[PDB]
Design a protein around this motif. Structure first.
Motif, PDB file in Angstrom:
ATOM      1  N   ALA A 141     -20.165   5.410  42.786  1.00 10.59           N
ATOM      2  CA  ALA A 141     -19.891   6.837  42.890  1.00 10.59           C
ATOM      3  C   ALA A 141     -20.385   7.531  41.629  1.00 10.59           C
ATOM      4  O   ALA A 141     -20.676   6.892  40.616  1.00 10.59           O
ATOM      5  CB  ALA A 141     -18.400   7.104  43.109  1.00 10.59           C
ATOM      6  N   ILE A 142     -20.474   8.855  41.709  1.00  8.49           N
ATOM      7  CA  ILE A 142     -20.910   9.670  40.583  1.00  8.49           C
ATOM      8  C   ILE A 142     -19.728   9.926  39.659  1.00  8.49           C
ATOM      9  O   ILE A 142     -18.604  10.176  40.110  1.00  8.49           O
ATOM     10  CB  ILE A 142     -21.534  10.986  41.085  1.00  8.49           C
ATOM     11  N   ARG A 143     -19.983   9.860  38.359  1.00 10.93           N
ATOM     12  CA  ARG A 143     -18.925  10.038  37.371  1.00 10.93           C
ATOM     13  C   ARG A 143     -18.409  11.475  37.394  1.00 10.93           C
ATOM     14  O   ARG A 143     -19.206  12.412  37.286  1.00 10.93           O
ATOM     15  CB  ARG A 143     -19.455   9.692  35.981  1.00 10.93           C
ATOM     16  N   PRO A 144     -17.102  11.695  37.530  1.00 16.33           N
ATOM     17  CA  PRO A 144     -16.576  13.059  37.404  1.00 16.33           C
ATOM     18  C   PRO A 144     -16.703  13.582  35.981  1.00 16.33           C
ATOM     19  O   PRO A 144     -16.722  12.819  35.012  1.00 16.33           O
ATOM     20  CB  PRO A 144     -15.104  12.916  37.810  1.00 16.33           C
ATOM     21  N   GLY A 145     -16.793  14.901  35.865  1.00 16.64           N
ATOM     22  CA  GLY A 145     -16.796  15.548  34.566  1.00 16.64           C
ATOM     23  C   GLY A 145     -18.163  15.602  33.915  1.00 16.64           C
ATOM     24  O   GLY A 145     -19.201  15.306  34.513  1.00 16.64           O
ATOM     25  N   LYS A 146     -18.146  15.990  32.636  1.00 16.41           N
ATOM     26  CA  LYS A 146     -19.386  16.224  31.901  1.00 16.41           C
ATOM     27  C   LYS A 146     -20.180  14.946  31.670  1.00 16.41           C
ATOM     28  O   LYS A 146     -21.362  15.023  31.321  1.00 16.41           O
ATOM     29  CB  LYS A 146     -19.090  16.892  30.554  1.00 16.41           C
ATOM     30  N   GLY A 147     -19.566  13.776  31.846  1.00 21.52           N
ATOM     31  CA  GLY A 147     -20.280  12.536  31.593  1.00 21.52           C
ATOM     32  C   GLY A 147     -21.495  12.349  32.480  1.00 21.52           C
ATOM     33  O   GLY A 147     -22.443  11.658  32.099  1.00 21.52           O
ATOM     34  N   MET A 149     -23.874  14.336  33.270  1.00 28.78           N
ATOM     35  CA  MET A 149     -25.088  14.889  32.682  1.00 28.78           C
ATOM     36  C   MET A 149     -25.409  14.284  31.322  1.00 28.78           C
ATOM     37  O   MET A 149     -26.390  14.695  30.695  1.00 28.78           O
ATOM     38  CB  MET A 149     -24.971  16.413  32.555  1.00 28.78           C
ATOM     39  N   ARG A 150     -24.614  13.322  30.854  1.00 32.97           N
ATOM     40  CA  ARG A 150     -24.853  12.634  29.592  1.00 32.97           C
ATOM     41  C   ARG A 150     -25.492  11.265  29.802  1.00 32.97           C
ATOM     42  O   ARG A 150     -25.225  10.330  29.041  1.00 32.97           O
ATOM     43  CB  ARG A 150     -23.546  12.494  28.811  1.00 32.97           C
ATOM     44  N   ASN A 151     -26.327  11.127  30.832  1.00 36.01           N
ATOM     45  CA  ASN A 151     -26.993   9.864  31.147  1.00 36.01           C
ATOM     46  C   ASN A 151     -25.987   8.758  31.463  1.00 36.01           C
ATOM     47  O   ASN A 151     -26.240   7.580  31.210  1.00 36.01           O
ATOM     48  CB  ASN A 151     -27.923   9.438  30.008  1.00 36.01           C
ATOM     49  N   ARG A 152     -24.841   9.138  32.020  1.00 34.70           N
ATOM     50  CA  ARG A 152     -23.811   8.219  32.499  1.00 34.70           C
ATOM     51  C   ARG A 152     -23.470   8.552  33.946  1.00 34.70           C
ATOM     52  O   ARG A 152     -22.312   8.746  34.321  1.00 34.70           O
ATOM     53  CB  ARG A 152     -22.575   8.265  31.604  1.00 34.70           C
ATOM     54  N   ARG A 153     -24.514   8.638  34.773  1.00 30.39           N
ATOM     55  CA  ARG A 153     -24.394   9.246  36.094  1.00 30.39           C
ATOM     56  C   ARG A 153     -23.381   8.515  36.972  1.00 30.39           C
ATOM     57  O   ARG A 153     -22.535   9.147  37.613  1.00 30.39           O
ATOM     58  CB  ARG A 153     -25.769   9.269  36.768  1.00 30.39           C
TER      59      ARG A 153
ATOM     60  N   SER B  10     -33.589   9.059  30.621  1.00 33.27           N
ATOM     61  CA  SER B  10     -32.914  10.326  30.392  1.00 33.27           C
ATOM     62  C   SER B  10     -33.132  11.260  31.576  1.00 33.27           C
ATOM     63  O   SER B  10     -34.267  11.472  32.013  1.00 33.27           O
ATOM     64  CB  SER B  10     -33.423  10.971  29.105  1.00 33.27           C
ATOM     65  N   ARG B  11     -32.034  11.815  32.092  1.00 31.86           N
ATOM     66  CA  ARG B  11     -32.128  12.786  33.177  1.00 31.86           C
ATOM     67  C   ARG B  11     -32.908  14.019  32.743  1.00 31.86           C
ATOM     68  O   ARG B  11     -33.747  14.531  33.493  1.00 31.86           O
ATOM     69  CB  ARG B  11     -30.721  13.167  33.642  1.00 31.86           C
ATOM     70  N   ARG B  12     -32.649  14.504  31.528  1.00 31.67           N
ATOM     71  CA  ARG B  12     -33.334  15.690  31.026  1.00 31.67           C
ATOM     72  C   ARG B  12     -34.843  15.479  30.987  1.00 31.67           C
ATOM     73  O   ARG B  12     -35.616  16.349  31.403  1.00 31.67           O
ATOM     74  CB  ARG B  12     -32.795  16.031  29.636  1.00 31.67           C
ATOM     75  N   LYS B  13     -35.283  14.323  30.487  1.00 28.34           N
ATOM     76  CA  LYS B  13     -36.715  14.067  30.378  1.00 28.34           C
ATOM     77  C   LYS B  13     -37.355  13.892  31.751  1.00 28.34           C
ATOM     78  O   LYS B  13     -38.473  14.368  31.982  1.00 28.34           O
ATOM     79  CB  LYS B  13     -36.959  12.839  29.502  1.00 28.34           C
ATOM     80  N   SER B  14     -36.667  13.218  32.675  1.00 32.92           N
ATOM     81  CA  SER B  14     -37.221  13.029  34.013  1.00 32.92           C
ATOM     82  C   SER B  14     -37.451  14.368  34.703  1.00 32.92           C
ATOM     83  O   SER B  14     -38.515  14.606  35.284  1.00 32.92           O
ATOM     84  CB  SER B  14     -36.289  12.152  34.851  1.00 32.92           C
ATOM     85  N   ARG B  15     -36.459  15.256  34.646  1.00 30.15           N
ATOM     86  CA  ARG B  15     -36.594  16.552  35.301  1.00 30.15           C
ATOM     87  C   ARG B  15     -37.695  17.389  34.659  1.00 30.15           C
ATOM     88  O   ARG B  15     -38.468  18.047  35.361  1.00 30.15           O
ATOM     89  CB  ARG B  15     -35.260  17.293  35.270  1.00 30.15           C
ATOM     90  N   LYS B  16     -37.785  17.375  33.328  1.00 25.65           N
ATOM     91  CA  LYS B  16     -38.833  18.142  32.663  1.00 25.65           C
ATOM     92  C   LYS B  16     -40.216  17.628  33.039  1.00 25.65           C
ATOM     93  O   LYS B  16     -41.132  18.418  33.294  1.00 25.65           O
ATOM     94  CB  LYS B  16     -38.642  18.102  31.147  1.00 25.65           C
ATOM     95  N   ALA B  17     -40.389  16.307  33.081  1.00 23.48           N
ATOM     96  CA  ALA B  17     -41.689  15.748  33.432  1.00 23.48           C
ATOM     97  C   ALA B  17     -42.074  16.086  34.866  1.00 23.48           C
ATOM     98  O   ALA B  17     -43.264  16.206  35.177  1.00 23.48           O
ATOM     99  CB  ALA B  17     -41.684  14.234  33.229  1.00 23.48           C
ATOM    100  N   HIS B  18     -41.088  16.240  35.751  1.00 23.78           N
ATOM    101  CA  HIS B  18     -41.378  16.547  37.146  1.00 23.78           C
ATOM    102  C   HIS B  18     -41.795  18.003  37.327  1.00 23.78           C
ATOM    103  O   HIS B  18     -42.790  18.290  38.001  1.00 23.78           O
ATOM    104  CB  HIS B  18     -40.158  16.233  38.014  1.00 23.78           C
TER     105      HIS B  18
END
Ligand SMILES: [K+]
Ligand SMILES: [K+]
Ligand SMILES: [K+]
Ligand SMILES: [K+]
Ligand SMILES: [K+]
Ligand SMILES: [K+]
Ligand SMILES: [K+]
Ligand SMILES: [K+]
Ligand SMILES: [K+]
Ligand SMILES: [K+]
Ligand SMILES: [K+]
Ligand SMILES: [K+]
Ligand SMILES: [K+]
Ligand SMILES: [K+]
Ligand SMILES: [K+]
Ligand SMILES: [K+]
Ligand SMILES: [K+]
Ligand SMILES: [K+]
Ligand SMILES: [K+]
Ligand SMILES: [K+]
Ligand SMILES: [K+]
Ligand SMILES: [K+]
Ligand SMILES: [K+]
Ligand SMILES: [K+]
Ligand SMILES: [K+]
Ligand SMILES: [K+]
Ligand SMILES: [K+]
Ligand SMILES: [K+]
Ligand SMILES: [K+]
Ligand SMILES: [K+]
Ligand SMILES: [K+]
Ligand SMILES: [K+]
Ligand SMILES: [K+]
Ligand SMILES: [K+]
Ligand SMILES: [Mg+2]
Ligand SMILES: [Mg+2]
Ligand SMILES: [Mg+2]
Ligand SMILES: [Mg+2]
Ligand SMILES: [Mg+2]
Ligand SMILES: [Mg+2]
Ligand SMILES: [Mg+2]
Ligand SMILES: [Mg+2]
Ligand SMILES: [Mg+2]
Ligand SMILES: [Mg+2]
Ligand SMILES: [Mg+2]
Ligand SMILES: [Mg+2]
Ligand SMILES: [Mg+2]
Ligand SMILES: [Mg+2]
Ligand SMILES: [Mg+2]
Ligand SMILES: [Mg+2]
Ligand SMILES: [Mg+2]
Ligand SMILES: [Mg+2]
Ligand SMILES: [Mg+2]
Ligand SMILES: [Mg+2]
Ligand SMILES: [Mg+2]
Ligand SMILES: [Mg+2]
Ligand SMILES: [Mg+2]
Ligand SMILES: [Mg+2]
Ligand SMILES: [Mg+2]
Ligand SMILES: [Mg+2]
Ligand SMILES: [Mg+2]
Ligand SMILES: [Mg+2]
Ligand SMILES: [Mg+2]
Ligand SMILES: [Mg+2]
Ligand SMILES: [Mg+2]
Ligand SMILES: [Mg+2]
Ligand SMILES: [Mg+2]
Ligand SMILES: [Mg+2]
Ligand SMILES: [Mg+2]
Ligand SMILES: [Mg+2]
Ligand SMILES: [Mg+2]
Ligand SMILES: [Mg+2]
Ligand SMILES: [Mg+2]
Ligand SMILES: [Mg+2]
Ligand SMILES: [Mg+2]
Ligand SMILES: [Mg+2]
Ligand SMILES: [Mg+2]
Ligand SMILES: [Mg+2]
Ligand SMILES: [Mg+2]
Ligand SMILES: [Mg+2]
Ligand SMILES: [Mg+2]
Ligand SMILES: [Mg+2]
Ligand SMILES: [Mg+2]
Ligand SMILES: [Mg+2]
Ligand SMILES: [Mg+2]
Ligand SMILES: [Mg+2]
Ligand SMILES: [Mg+2]
Ligand SMILES: [Mg+2]
Ligand SMILES: [Mg+2]
Ligand SMILES: [Mg+2]
Ligand SMILES: [Mg+2]
Ligand SMILES: [Mg+2]
Ligand SMILES: [Mg+2]
Ligand SMILES: [Mg+2]
Ligand SMILES: [Mg+2]
Ligand SMILES: [Mg+2]
Ligand SMILES: [Mg+2]
Ligand SMILES: [Mg+2]
Ligand SMILES: [Mg+2]
Ligand SMILES: [Mg+2]
Ligand SMILES: [Mg+2]
Ligand SMILES: [Mg+2]
Ligand SMILES: [Mg+2]
Ligand SMILES: [Mg+2]
Ligand SMILES: [Mg+2]
Ligand SMILES: [Mg+2]
Ligand SMILES: [Mg+2]
Ligand SMILES: [Mg+2]
Ligand SMILES: [Mg+2]
Ligand SMILES: [Mg+2]
Ligand SMILES: [Mg+2]
Ligand SMILES: [Mg+2]
Ligand SMILES: [Mg+2]
Ligand SMILES: [Mg+2]
Ligand SMILES: [Mg+2]
Ligand SMILES: [Mg+2]
Ligand SMILES: [Mg+2]
Ligand SMILES: [Mg+2]
Ligand SMILES: [Mg+2]
Ligand SMILES: [Mg+2]
Ligand SMILES: [Mg+2]
Ligand SMILES: [Mg+2]
Ligand SMILES: [Mg+2]
Ligand SMILES: [Mg+2]
Ligand SMILES: [Mg+2]
Ligand SMILES: [Mg+2]
Ligand SMILES: [Mg+2]
Ligand SMILES: [Mg+2]
Ligand SMILES: [Mg+2]
Ligand SMILES: [Mg+2]
Lengths: 254, 132
Positions: A141-147, A149-153, B10-18
């Motif tokens: 499952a997807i992590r709840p909260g701000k985590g 978007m911190r590469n801890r999906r 990194s999610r940020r880098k993947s989205r920017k590259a796309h």
RNA sequence: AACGACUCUCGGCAACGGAUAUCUCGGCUCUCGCAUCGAUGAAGAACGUAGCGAAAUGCGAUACUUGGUGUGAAUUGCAGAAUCCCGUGAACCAUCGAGUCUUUGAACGCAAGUUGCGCCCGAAGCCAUGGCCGAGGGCACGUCUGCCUGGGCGUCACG
RNA sequence: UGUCUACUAUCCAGCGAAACCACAGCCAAGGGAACGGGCUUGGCAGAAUCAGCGGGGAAAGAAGACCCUGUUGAGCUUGAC
RNA sequence: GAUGAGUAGGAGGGCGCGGCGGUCGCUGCAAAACCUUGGGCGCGAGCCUGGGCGGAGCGGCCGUCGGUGCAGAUCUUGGUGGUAGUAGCAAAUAUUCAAAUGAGAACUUUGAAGGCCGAAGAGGGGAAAGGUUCCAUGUGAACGGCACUUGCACAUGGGUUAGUCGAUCCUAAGGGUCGGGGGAACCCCGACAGAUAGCGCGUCGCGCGUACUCCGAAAGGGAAUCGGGUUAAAAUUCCU
RNA sequence: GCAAAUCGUUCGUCUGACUUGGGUAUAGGGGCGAAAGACUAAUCGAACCGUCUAGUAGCUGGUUCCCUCCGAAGUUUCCC
RNA sequence: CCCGUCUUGAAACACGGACCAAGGAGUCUGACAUGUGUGCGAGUCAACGGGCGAGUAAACCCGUAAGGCGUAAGGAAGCUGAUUGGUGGGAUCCCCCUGAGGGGUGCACCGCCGACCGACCUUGAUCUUCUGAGAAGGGUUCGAGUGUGAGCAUACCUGUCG
RNA sequence: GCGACCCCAGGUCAGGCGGGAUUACCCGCUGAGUUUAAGCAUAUCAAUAAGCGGAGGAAAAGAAACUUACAAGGAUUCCCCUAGUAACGGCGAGCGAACCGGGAACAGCCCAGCCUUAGAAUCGGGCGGCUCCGUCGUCCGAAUUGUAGUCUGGAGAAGCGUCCUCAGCGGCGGACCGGGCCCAAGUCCCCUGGAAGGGGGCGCCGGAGAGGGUGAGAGCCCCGUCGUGCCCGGACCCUGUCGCACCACGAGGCGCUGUCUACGAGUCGGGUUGUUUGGGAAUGCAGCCCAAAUCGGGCGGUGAAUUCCGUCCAAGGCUAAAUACUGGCGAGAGACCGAUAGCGAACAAGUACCGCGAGGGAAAGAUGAAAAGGACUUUGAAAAGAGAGUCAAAGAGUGCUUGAAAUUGUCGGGAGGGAAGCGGAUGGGGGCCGGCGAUGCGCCCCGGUCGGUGUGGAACGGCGAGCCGGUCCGCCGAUCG
């Protein structure tokens, strides 16, 4: 394993602001000079000020790490290993071991030769460890909260831990793609995987070679370890923890 | 799990590259699966969509529609398909953009480069997937 | 002392405002790799440049690009293009080795609130060795090596 | 003291700020941080509104410049170090 | 069984916010946030739930961590009231009539009348400074502290023509410099410690030769343009 | 407030130590001053700008959840 | 009677506060200390570094005359360096007895008094390389000493200081 | 007068070199005060900020005129320790190194001087050739006021003999660094929905379940990810192998030999002054004065003389690695921030704007899956409204997701004789609440339905071989529940 974080040392102080002083019907907080812009006359430098400097700014030289004495770390590992052989503790930690033939679960060394993930899963089914592995995948499952978007999906439950005793065994790569399944060499057991979340009762699958090395690695109560120089297993303050036997013994009840 | 040190998770880098990818890169990102008939013929799974290809929509409100590609609008990450249109409030007709991953290529616009590309895609599969 | 106005008050709805929640091609921090500006004119500054643009981004009168190579069919807000498609080949594509690179600036003929004030060389062209015309370039300072032309009885030698 | 003219104020159409604001705004005495709009005891007390007025709001304007304190200064002086 | 006050202060047990390691769940058959004269639990911090809105995430429990709890600081930033349709629009003498135009005229334009500036001007130019405000046409809004059909506003286009007017040249107070003298160096002095610059006449030679061929005036010095005509907007510049 | 010094009337001087434009020289413990500590860009008994600097303060102001328990001191000595 | 605040004393004719949202103040770090939790214990500590390892900033392993703290103190220093407990109370246990009883046991802790090491003082048979050795015998002196170790690492609160 | 040399001058003479920019780290100089000391002047802040210069991928330092007093270590740098120690200090506040020891790295060297004199054996430039970062030839210069060789104290020169060592390029490959290309598995059935990427079912890949995209939680739709394979290029260094060449004249090594054995001056050192250091009768540095030595000189942390002892050899030079890095370029990561936060700047931000100037310096992110961005009718001068249309939704309508509070309008309920609110207690009027409040239970018979002691099997259990049990199936009897 933590990486340091800290705000910029110059944050909130890139300004020549000075206090207006008293006698002008405003607080004495420093203020931006100049004019012709909304910024002019605004407060600065204050932790209570918009765009100011936070109170006690975080510094990189915070004491992030800890060095626990080695003998205490070995004590913790031994307790975790012992807890993994108690089915009540393993069940209490959330593992599904209802179909496991026996604990400790020791399997033939031929499992170390498995190369394909498909064959690795069949091995788990035979020994009854698949249901615990299936639990981990179904908990993805997807992590709840701000985590998130911190590469801890993604988060998930822990599956079985497989311990092997042969260096370079091919099962390390046949099992690694299975969610929740961790692989560790017996000579370098890690507490963070033996008691995840600081909770005892990890479900452990031992290979025959790894299981036979435990005496040499950790020694016994009589003789010391062969690989931990001068180490002996700790003793408990209570030889027999079964109170009912002591309290209801003939000696006490007399 | 990835092990290449040159690859970022990194999610940020993947989205920017796309979303900043150049037009040549967007061509590969805008790929569509071949139909089951073409897959068995050329032994190829995916292909970048081309202007004169024929595709069938397999997802969305236009599922089942078939037509010929008329414009690969790479800037908008969509393709326009002949007769796949809607009517504006004023009655004018405008093409509806569809993501190429939501269609299936039924016929390929073959050419000298396209045929050579098919050979390279099949060459690896015929060896790295079967001979191994 | 009804009704109604006014004031206050409670509720529904409508306003005013942009809090909260969920987001993020940004920031911050740590770690790693590399060693590459300039008189062969740098950094910076100015002006110009697109079929329709002011800015930002790019570029230099070859001016949002030339050339080579790779990729292999777009660019796109509009217009237009027998520009381009089994191909010496589309692209506001990628990349770089060919090539272009205005006025300035350490800035170098002298200056500068001046597109101001000088000198030298000179292809091409043209009128009868000369004359006009003229693309383009040159002329700072300090200093090293070598060289040419000189000064002083500074130290001599010979007439 | 009176009176005359103009421009205001005044009324209208249009346009349209600011200072200030704990909550508020009728009094007498009492007690009280010894000078109350609020408390105690009395006088009383009747919607909404207009033009003026300077008694009070210890009115506004400003972290008293006078005076004192600080182991704060600064300008100036000299037989201070 | 006894007992219950509490500022400054101490301590305990709890509540709430955001992550991390675990664990147990919820959600497009509707998550978070927010709204409610719905209901209930706890001494209380708070918690649970109905309904509504919203349209994609969220929560419980154990451990652990922190930029973790506001009514105040003449607190910060943003927003919003009462004051209040209130204070206020008042210097520079002044407007009136008719017609045209326009959805709309006390305010635009024409004509007529009545006044003012009264040549040290409310007239006609220029230097600084500004930089297109110049001219034509058009105009939804905004702006011109009432209004506007209006315009120094907005939109589109157009407009500045020199051998003779200036700059340019000359030198003024002075400025910037070579060499030399100082100076860690940035820099200081400024032709004062010095083989000046070159010029003239013949045709490369002779003669001369006192260390700046520099900057410094759109009012000082200074080669030469006058009428007549011409544009919506330029002229001693265009035409003759 | 028309105005962070203006307006009305009334006043001083008016061929001179007169008024004024432009150019030019003097810059912060410095300049300049027919001298008022005047003036040096609404800033002067030491300008303005950035930095040292989050300067120091025995002094003023503020200092964020709940119940429960215990519960003070303004007195001693020493101290520019 | 209006909250917050300083105050012996505030409803005050003491100050801040027109209203709302959001932001907004005992923190991080070094040293030390008491307390508590944990590990080991006359030891303790993997700390610089090395070997490695989740293809890996973690975890795991390594102290061979390493090092820190502790294991011995006194003295300015030259130097010397612990002869190893007596007693009054006292927890617990044992025996008799069934009393506010009597014996044995006597940990922790406290009081009291010796002894031992050292500074200072004093003392000197018997020896010696002449300045040392030490049979005996000391002291109203002094010490952050000895008389069968308690420390080291680590976590956190509180407190002092930068 | 003609020549040589010396010094100097001119040259748009031929060919070269230098200036400036950048700030994270690095080298040199210059150099405060706030502050602390509860005042303050030495001190401290600080050998710091500001100021002026100079470099590189590192810089600087560096092969002992050292440490030490030991059974001795052995260029430099860096980490741990030494150590908050010795020392310094109104001996106040405070301040504070080094050696040993353990580690990272490791590397050594070049000149000056007596020594070609049967030969300046050296170097530059012009021109020419070649196998062109160079080399050869030739010419003109530099240089004897000394180029090149030999030598550097660890040595060395010379002599002697041991007879040990020493002479290049090329081909291929590896290693190293950089890039490019192909390559796993569902978009199968049902339901909801605008959209499946959700739920349920049935499958599959996995050395790939990192990450992202696509109309909602996507391993299997797309890009990638794992792991091979193939291809191209850069470095010319290191390394493996092969081919060719392979003159020891000379030089070096080793051994011995009577002898010789040259080593940096206004420098060391001393006095004095200033500064600085933990350095204290003076740690370094600098000014001025004095001014050396050669069986000698410097150091040995208390000044001085005397006698020893240990130690090194200054006044010339080069040198990789371990170390540093808030700048530049590229890359990875995070218990960090989430639009008043985080850089001042998520956006045409060092921008708009302000200041004569040095400088100062903001605000400002989110329609929808897709513009499908609202045709048309009607009213109005116009803005716009009304109706209609698009969309899952305009209750998403171009500053448009969600849309709180202050504050405002309107409708509805209610109250009001110079405040209102608030605590406690009821009442009136509202609003709300069926877990707001039950309807069962026991005993009878009618019917229906479902199971019933003793022996057989099936899979097990409690107590410890053996006893003691229940569950399920079947068969008899029993005939109730
Ligand atoms: K009402
Ligand atoms: K209302
Ligand atoms: K938000
Ligand atoms: K240039
Ligand atoms: K441009
Ligand atoms: K190109
Ligand atoms: K000039
Ligand atoms: K009015
Ligand atoms: K009174
Ligand atoms: K003063
Ligand atoms: K959780
Ligand atoms: K509720
Ligand atoms: K938590
Ligand atoms: K003018
Ligand atoms: K002219
Ligand atoms: K002139
Ligand atoms: K004159
Ligand atoms: K004329
Ligand atoms: K006059
Ligand atoms: K000053
Ligand atoms: K005080
Ligand atoms: K107060
Ligand atoms: K007071
Ligand atoms: K008050
Ligand atoms: K030890
Ligand atoms: K070790
Ligand atoms: K002593
Ligand atoms: K030559
Ligand atoms: K996805
Ligand atoms: K020598
Ligand atoms: K000294
Ligand atoms: K010596
Ligand atoms: K900002
Ligand atoms: K919406
Ligand atoms: Mg005020
Ligand atoms: Mg900030
Ligand atoms: Mg949340
Ligand atoms: Mg561009
Ligand atoms: Mg120039
Ligand atoms: Mg010019
Ligand atoms: Mg009264
Ligand atoms: Mg009052
Ligand atoms: Mg009363
Ligand atoms: Mg009344
Ligand atoms: Mg009054
Ligand atoms: Mg009045
Ligand atoms: Mg007041
Ligand atoms: Mg005061
Ligand atoms: Mg004051
Ligand atoms: Mg004070
Ligand atoms: Mg005092
Ligand atoms: Mg003073
Ligand atoms: Mg109490
Ligand atoms: Mg939470
Ligand atoms: Mg309400
Ligand atoms: Mg909760
Ligand atoms: Mg945080
Ligand atoms: Mg906070
Ligand atoms: Mg608040
Ligand atoms: Mg408060
Ligand atoms: Mg306030
Ligand atoms: Mg405000
Ligand atoms: Mg207001
Ligand atoms: Mg009025
Ligand atoms: Mg007025
Ligand atoms: Mg009027
Ligand atoms: Mg008037
Ligand atoms: Mg008028
Ligand atoms: Mg008049
Ligand atoms: Mg007149
Ligand atoms: Mg006149
Ligand atoms: Mg108006
Ligand atoms: Mg005009
Ligand atoms: Mg305009
Ligand atoms: Mg003229
Ligand atoms: Mg002059
Ligand atoms: Mg100058
Ligand atoms: Mg000079
Ligand atoms: Mg002269
Ligand atoms: Mg001249
Ligand atoms: Mg001039
Ligand atoms: Mg003139
Ligand atoms: Mg004109
Ligand atoms: Mg006026
Ligand atoms: Mg001066
Ligand atoms: Mg004067
Ligand atoms: Mg005076
Ligand atoms: Mg300042
Ligand atoms: Mg005293
Ligand atoms: Mg008082
Ligand atoms: Mg009070
Ligand atoms: Mg009073
Ligand atoms: Mg006060
Ligand atoms: Mg107030
Ligand atoms: Mg808040
Ligand atoms: Mg402790
Ligand atoms: Mg040791
Ligand atoms: Mg002694
Ligand atoms: Mg003694
Ligand atoms: Mg030349
Ligand atoms: Mg002080
Ligand atoms: Mg003080
Ligand atoms: Mg002071
Ligand atoms: Mg500096
Ligand atoms: Mg430089
Ligand atoms: Mg460089
Ligand atoms: Mg390095
Ligand atoms: Mg170097
Ligand atoms: Mg040497
Ligand atoms: Mg050394
Ligand atoms: Mg120590
Ligand atoms: Mg110091
Ligand atoms: Mg060492
Ligand atoms: Mg020589
Ligand atoms: Mg030799
Ligand atoms: Mg020799
Ligand atoms: Mg794929
Ligand atoms: Mg499924
Ligand atoms: Mg959605
Ligand atoms: Mg790979
Ligand atoms: Mg020497
Ligand atoms: Mg000296
Ligand atoms: Mg100095
Ligand atoms: Mg060097
Ligand atoms: Mg870097
Ligand atoms: Mg910001
Ligand atoms: Mg926020
Ligand atoms: Mg959405
Ligand atoms: Mg909205
Ligand atoms: Mg409201």
């Amino acid at each position: 394993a933590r990486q340091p974080y800290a705000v910029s040392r110059k944050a909130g102080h890139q300004t020549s602001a000075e206090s207006w002083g008293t006698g002008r019907a405003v607080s004495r907080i420093p203020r931006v000079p100049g004019g012709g812009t909304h910024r002019a006359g605004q407060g600065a430098f204050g932790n209570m000020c918009r765009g100011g400097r936070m109170f006690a700014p975080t510094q990189t030289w915070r004491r992030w790490h800890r060095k626990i004495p080695v003998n205490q770390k070995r004590y913790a590992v031994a307790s975790a290993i012992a807890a993994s052989s108690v089915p009540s503790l393993v069940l209490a930690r959330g593992h599904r071991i209802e179909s496991v033939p026996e604990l400790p679960l020791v399997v033939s060394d031929s499992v170390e030769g498995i190369e394909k993930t498909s064959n690795a899963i069949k091995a788990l089914k035979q020994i009854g460890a698949y249901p615990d592995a299936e639990k981990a995948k179904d908990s993805h499952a997807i992590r709840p909260g701000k985590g998130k978007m911190r590469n801890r999906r993604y988060i998930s439950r822990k599956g079985p831990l497989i311990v092997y005793g042969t260096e370079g065994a091919k099962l390390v790569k046949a099992f690694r793609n299975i969610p929740g399944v961790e692989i560790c060499h017996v000579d370098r057991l890690n507490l963070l995987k033996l008691a995840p979340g600081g909770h005892l009762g990890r479900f452990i699958i031992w290979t025959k070679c790894a299981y036979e090395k435990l005496d040499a690695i950790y020694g016994t109560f009589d003789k010391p370890s062969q690989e931990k120089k001068g180490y002996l297993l700790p003793r408990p303050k209570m030889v027999n923890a079964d109170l009912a036997r002591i309290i209801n013994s003939d000696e006490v009840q007399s | 799990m990835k092990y290449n040190p040159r690859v970022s998770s990194s999610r940020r880098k993947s989205r920017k590259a796309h979303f900043t990818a150049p037009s040549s890169v967007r061509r590969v990102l805008m790929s569509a699966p071949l139909s089951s008939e073409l897959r068995a013929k050329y032994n190829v799974r995916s292909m970048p969509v081309r202007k004169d290809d024929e595709v069938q929509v397999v997802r969305g409100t236009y599922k089942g529609r078939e037509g010929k590609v008329v414009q690969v609008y790479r800037k908008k990450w969509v393709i326009h398909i002949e007769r796949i249109t809607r009517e504006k409030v004023n009655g004018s007709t405008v093409n509806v953009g569809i993501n190429p991953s939501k269609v299936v290529v039924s016929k390929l616009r073959l050419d000298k480069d396209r045929r050579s590309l098919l050979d390279r895609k099949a060459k690896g599969r015929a060896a790295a997937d079967k001979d191994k």
